[PDB]
């Protein structure tokens, strides 16, 4: 398809809308041009959703509890409000961890204040205070409590900050208030922000006066890898084989102690810029700790990123970097030799949240596949900036894509593979298009590092070339 056919497709799709939504949606749909290297010049992002168009977006609570806070394994997180939010988000996200659940770790459990009508009327602050005490009795090895606000908390005028301060002092315990009510902002994105501000104000400082931690020149932190299917452990093994010491890793398989030790490190390695740039900037200004983005998705990006990381230290680390590279070279070369022939020339459309739509492009390229359309749920313009340069000319870009748009684009572009979320999966499968989940990894993974690339290639292959796709037409039709 040519530029003119895409642009034509865009206006064709907008026809169905009433004028108000039409005009807004036009601004969120663009064709990429390598001639303009500046996000705004092409597309608009991080605006309100148009009502009733079937956006794929979640809320600020999903961004704060589901994404940033929930993975922290040795704290108890309370879904404070009515029963729904905590239930639907119980163990739906694969932020993997090591611990003894119900005893020292609490990730896949659902703790809630389960609001009734009386708590709407009189407020829930007295119930929150009692809940905190019941939690200390029943879960004595918890090392901290967060309070994740659902929609009604802010709307009835509760003061969870006051309950948290008074109860924190009484019990000599960290209780973190989080105002991540789902009506706040436009998407999961503001939830990230509020949750980073909460880490900052209530946890990250706890050890500013302590000098006992013995440091080394090679201390780093892995910030914003949520360890989907083990993703962070496959990234971590490579940093440790390269001679760095990973003092902290959060929030996937993250402990509160390692959040509190993060200000001790020499470099913050940031996997997800969108969710964690707020805290990373705060740490540079307050502690003089630099940060850098990196990508361990596919061998090309992994290799480039190891080199860039190594480059921030001395010769000895750069040496180990080249040894790690030589070690895994045969393994990834074999994955390529086996799977690239089976995937070469096939065309992929992506739709994910705030990072993966650009971050996974390199891995597809290492298998000789072409990303012909990508898009984000809740990215900002600095994200679209990095995207336009990683995507080919005349590719489609879509922001806060509606159900209708995504289905009509696909019908016309006819990609060979789609990578999106659970809400999209069963749609395109029915239309005969191979589909892979690019949040949950379809219950597979890891996809990070050299070990994850293997898994990643097997998965794309098993699905794209599955014999089920030849069977959708009954032979008598």
């Amino acid at each position: 398809m040519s530029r003119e056919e895409v642009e034509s497709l865009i206006q064709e799709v907008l026809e169905v809308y009433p004028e108000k939504a039409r005009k807004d949606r036009n601004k969120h749909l663009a064709v990429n041009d390598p001639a303009v290297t500046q996000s705004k010049k092409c597309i608009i992002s991080n605006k309100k959703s148009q009502p009733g168009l079937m956006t794929i977006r979640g809320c600020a609570y999903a961004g704060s509890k589901g994404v940033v806070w929930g993975p922290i394994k040795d704290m108890i997180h309370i879904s404070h409000g009515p029963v729904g939010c905590g239930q639907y988000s119980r163990a739906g996200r694969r932020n993997y961890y090591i611990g003894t659940t119900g005893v020292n770790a609490f990730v896949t459990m659902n703790f809630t204040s389960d609001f009734q009508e009386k708590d709407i009327v009189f407020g829930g602050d007295k119930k929150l205070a009692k809940l905190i005490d019941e939690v200390e009795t029943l879960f004595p090895l918890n090392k901290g409590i967060s309070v994740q606000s659902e929609c009604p908390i802010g709307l009835i005028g509760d003061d969870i900050e006051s309950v948290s301060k008074v109860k924190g002092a009484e019990l000599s315990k960290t209780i973190v208030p989080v105002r991540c009510e789902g009506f706040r902002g436009v998407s999961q994105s503001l939830g990230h922000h509020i949750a980073n501000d909460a880490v900052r104000d209530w946890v990250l400082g706890k050890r500013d006066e302590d000098t006992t931690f013995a440091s080394t020149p090679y201390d780093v932190a892995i910030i914003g890898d949520y360890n989907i299917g083990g993703d962070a452990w496959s990234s971590r093994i490579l940093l440790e084989e390269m001679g760095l010491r990973c003092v902290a890793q959060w929030s996937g398989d993250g402990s509160i102690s390692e959040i509190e030790l993060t200000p001790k490190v020499k470099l913050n390695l940031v996997h997800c810029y969108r969710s964690m740039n707020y805290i990373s900037r705060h740490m540079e200004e307050k502690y003089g700790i630099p940060w850098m983005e990196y990508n361990f998705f596919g061998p090309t990006k992994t290799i480039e990123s190891l080199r860039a990381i190594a480059a921030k230290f001395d010769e000895s680390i750069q040496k180990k970097c080249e040894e790690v590279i030589a070690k895994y070279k045969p393994e990834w070369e074999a994955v390529v030799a086996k799977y690239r022939p089976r995937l070469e020339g096939k065309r992929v459309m992506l739709y994910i949240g705030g990072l993966r739509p650009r971050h996974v492009i390199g891995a597809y390229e290492d298998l000789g596949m072409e990303v012909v359309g990508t898009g984000y749920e809740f990215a900002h313009n600095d994200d679209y900036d990095r995207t336009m340069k990683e995507m080919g000319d005349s590719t489609l870009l879509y922001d806060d894509v509606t159900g209708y748009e995504f289905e009509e684009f696909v019908k016309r572009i006819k990609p060979d593979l789609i990578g999106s979320g659970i809400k999209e999966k069963f749609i395109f499968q029915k239309m005969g298009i191979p589909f892979r989940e690019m949040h949950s990894w379809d219950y597979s993974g890891p996809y990070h590092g050299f070990d994850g690339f293997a898994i990643f290639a097997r998965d794309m292959d098993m699905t794209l070339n599955n014999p089920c796709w030849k069977k959708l037409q009954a032979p008598w039709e």
């Binding site: 009433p18 009733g52 409000g81 009508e117 029943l138 709307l155 659970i422």
Partner: protein
């Protein structure tokens, strides 16, 4: 490392020596973890009678609920009408979760829209969201009807749905005669089954309240069937099948079976099947209305009795043997159609199965949970099989329901060791299966984590999960099953006996130790 010819996913990959050592250093260096001895000691304590007492003293904290919130059920009710878009007035985050909660249970698309209320609507109300939302929905997905429910944001701010929808028509955003039934569905009242009831009652009102004058009870010669919140496709099917076998004219009000089970044949179908608007308008002309799950269809019953003048019969859910008998006999009396040879034979085939499996079923002890109607049906069938339901937990149950279950229990010797718990959660149930250990659990996927904890204490303490209920996320296609009727009773009996035999095989597979009892024939 990977061997390219035998690739390892997370399991068993992180069991490789290099990962295990890396994981150990993470923990010893920086996680400041409680010692293993203390972890073991606290675990043991959480299995004790002492801890169960503190646990059942909770008033403020809920841990691991066995219920969801109203609007989830409203959506599922709305999914059951012809070319209908469920529409939740409020915040969009709720909608993403409703859809993905159902996607994972049915392995199917689920269509629902929000009108994306934000902080601005928090101040000024959601009026504009409704107007633009309805117009955008109608033009974009071309539903024949939009069924409106609410999220808790919109309940708290006090949005007037009726006015908001009337204004939307008055100002020309959707056509005057375009159907927009609505219901208030507050997440802080009752539960998801309550949302199902509120939505249904709002839809029945929309199509019937103001056209009551020409209606005559019985003039269409049909019986209305309201299924309630139902997530097994077989339960819809079996009711239709049985009524078709009796030659009973009927009308299933809210029927999502088609839209939740479309073919993968190259096209996506947003809408399929479902109760037509004509069937909802004509529903008052039926002989009567039968509620399949009455303990969550109370508001619907008040409406049907008060406005349609149907004498809704006192029938329990048709689950197990006696209550499928009663259901068929009531339908026979209402319709004047006899119970036919085919269903009499199907019944006696169920009893034959009971005669063939009673020795293995006898005295077997069960903990179980779910919604009120499903739970009492399971309890009742377990007693008919000679099983002892020892822990019966219904988080969204009420005191009147519990009294009805206690009476059921008292009428059988198999109920003597049974206790019913309402308002309790799956952390309460965890204690129960340690301190008064049963042989199996019957429940949804959340129970796999109770089975894990039991096994951590030792193999002798493990209580296996048998997956019946909602949601089931960790097996595939069990949502196609049947729990109602003789068919459903046959499927449950089979599942129960074979879970028992499977487990006995596991216990008797040790060669020269336990395999003396590893019998070929059982």
């Amino acid at each position: 490392s990977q061997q390219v010819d035998k690739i390892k996913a997370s399991y068993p990959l992180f069991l490789d020596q290099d990962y295990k050592d890396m994981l150990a250093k993470k923990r010893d260096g920086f996680e400041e973890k409680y010692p293993q001895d203390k972890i073991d000691e606290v675990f043991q304590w959480t299995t004790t009678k002492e801890y169960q007492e503190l646990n059942f003293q909770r008033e403020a904290l809920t841990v691991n609920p066995a219920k969801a919130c109203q609007p989830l059920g409203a959506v599922l009710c709305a999914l059951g009408f012809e070319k209908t878009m469920p529409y939740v007035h409020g915040s969009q985050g709720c909608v993403a979760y409703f859809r993905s909660y159902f996607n994972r249970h049915f392995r199917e698309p689920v269509s629902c829209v929000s009108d994306s209320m934000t902080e601005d609507a928090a101040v000024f109300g959601g009026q504009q969201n409704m107007k633009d939302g309805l117009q955008n929905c109608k033009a974009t997905y071309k539903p024949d009807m939009i069924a409106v429910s609410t999220t808790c944001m919109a309940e708290v701010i006090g949005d007037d749905l009726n006015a908001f929808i009337n204004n939307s028509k008055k100002e020309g955003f959707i056509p005057d005669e375009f159907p927009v039934p609505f219901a208030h569905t507050p997440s802080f009242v009752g539960s998801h089954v309550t949302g199902w009831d509120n939505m249904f009652e709002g839809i029945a009102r929309y199509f019937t309240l103001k056209s009551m004058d020409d209606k005559v009870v019985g003039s269409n010669k049909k019986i209305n069937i309201v299924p309630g919140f139902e997530t097994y496709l077989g339960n819809f099917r079996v009711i239709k099948r049985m009524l078709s076998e009796m030659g009973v004219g009927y009308s299933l009000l809210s029927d999502p079976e088609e839209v939740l089970d479309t073919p993968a044949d190259g096209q996506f179908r947003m809408y399929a099947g479902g109760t037509t608007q004509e069937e909802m308008k004509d529903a008052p002309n039926a002989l009567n209305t039968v509620l399949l799950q009455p303990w969550h269809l109370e508001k619907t019953k008040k409406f049907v009795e008060g406005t349609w003048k149907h004498e809704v019969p006192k029938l329990n859910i048709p689950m197990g043997l006696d209550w499928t008998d009663e259901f068929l006999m009531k339908v026979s009396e209402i319709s004047g159609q006899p119970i036919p040879a085919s269903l009499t034979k199907e019944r006696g085939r169920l009893v034959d199965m009971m005669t063939d499996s009673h020795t293995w079923l006898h005295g077997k002890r069960f903990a179980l949970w779910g919604d009120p109607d499903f739970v009492m049906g399971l309890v009742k069938f377990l007693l008919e099989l000679g099983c002892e339901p020892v822990h019966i937990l219904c988080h969204n149950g009420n005191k009147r329901w519990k009294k009805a279950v206690d009476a059921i229990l008292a009428a059988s010797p198999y109920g003597k060791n049974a206790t019913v718990y309402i308002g309790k959660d799956l952390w309460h149930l965890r204690s129960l299966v340690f301190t008064d250990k049963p042989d199996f659990m019957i429940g949804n996927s959340y129970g796999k984590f109770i089975q894990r904890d039991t096994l951590h204490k030792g193999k002798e303490f493990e209580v296996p999960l048998i997956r019946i209920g909602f949601p089931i996320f960790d097996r595939h296609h069990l949502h196609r099953s049947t729990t109602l009727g003789y068919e459903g009773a046959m499927q449950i009996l089979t599942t129960l006996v074979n879970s028992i035999l499977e487990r006995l095989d596991e216990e008797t597979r040790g060669m020269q130790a336990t395999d003396y009892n590893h019998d070929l024939v059982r």
